[PDB]
Amino acid sequence: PDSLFAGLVGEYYGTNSQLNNISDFRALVDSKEADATFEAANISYGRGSSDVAKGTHLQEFLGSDASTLSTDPGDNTDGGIYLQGYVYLEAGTYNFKVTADDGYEITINGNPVATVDNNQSVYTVTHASFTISESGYQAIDMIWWDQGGDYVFQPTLSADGGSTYFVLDSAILSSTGETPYT
Ligand SMILES: C[C@@H]1O[C@H](O)[C@@H](O)[C@H](O)[C@@H]1O
Ligand SMILES: [Ca+2]
Ligand SMILES: [Ca+2]
Ligand SMILES: [Ca+2]
Numbered sequence: 001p002d003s004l005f006a007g008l009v010g011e012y013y014g015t016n017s018q019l020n021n022i023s024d025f026r027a028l029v030d031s032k033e034a035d036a037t038f039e040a041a042n043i044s045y046g047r048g049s050s051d052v053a054k055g056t057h058l059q060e061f062l063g064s065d066a067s068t069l070s071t072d073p074g075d076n077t078d079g080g081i082y083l084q085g086y087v088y089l090e091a092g093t094y095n096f097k098v099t100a101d102d103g104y105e106i107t108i109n110g111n112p113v114a115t116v117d118n119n120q121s122v123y124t125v126t127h128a129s130f131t132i133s134e135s136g137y138q139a140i141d142m143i144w145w146d147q148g149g150d151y152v153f154q155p156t157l158s159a160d161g162g163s164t165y166f167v168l169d170s171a172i173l174s175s176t177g178e179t180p181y182t
């Protein structure tokens, strides 16, 4: 079965084709089995240089989560991650504020809540609010990629109208939606 841990299910995919947008990365995910799996328990990755998909840059980027890699991917020019699972959120209003190079998309309960559909050097976007109607574990997924060069990915979330933001980590993540005791 699907292991229960305090994190999202992570998949890494590399390619020697150019990633320009969300569609390109999603097509890469659809095209093959993941080059590596991991547990995404502390979703604040990077920053680094000289291509995420080369050498040990992925390990450096994933940091605290890299010890759960299923393998050490070989070199590629371009690469990214697909995260999916659950996040505990009380009913209320929230918004993401994301620092990234290159682009990304986060969905909650199937609906996009933070999107950058293009390549970019590091930039921080404060995204529009969204609502949670019922307290509990919410479905969440994320994609992020690097087309080359520098790389960073730090989604943060606010519950208090943008006064404070937190990283999504083992305090509130669940791989399956069951309560983790890990
Ligand atoms: C679009 C930008 O291109 C630059 O050359 C890269 O160094 C940045 O990391 C980013 O991907
Ligand atoms: Ca796949
Ligand atoms: Ca490697
Ligand atoms: Ca780190």
Ligand SMILES: [Ca+2]
Pocket (backbone or CB within 6 Å): 063, 064, 065, 066, 067, 068
């Ligand atoms: Ca670790």
Ligand SMILES: [Ca+2]
Pocket (backbone or CB within 6 Å): 107, 110, 111, 112
């Ligand atoms: Ca959708």
Ligand SMILES: [Ca+2]
Pocket (backbone or CB within 6 Å): 017, 018, 019, 077, 078, 147, 148
């Ligand atoms: Ca590229």
Ligand SMILES: [Ca+2]
Pocket (backbone or CB within 6 Å): 101, 102, 120, 146, 147, 148, 149, 150, 151
């Ligand atoms: Ca880049």
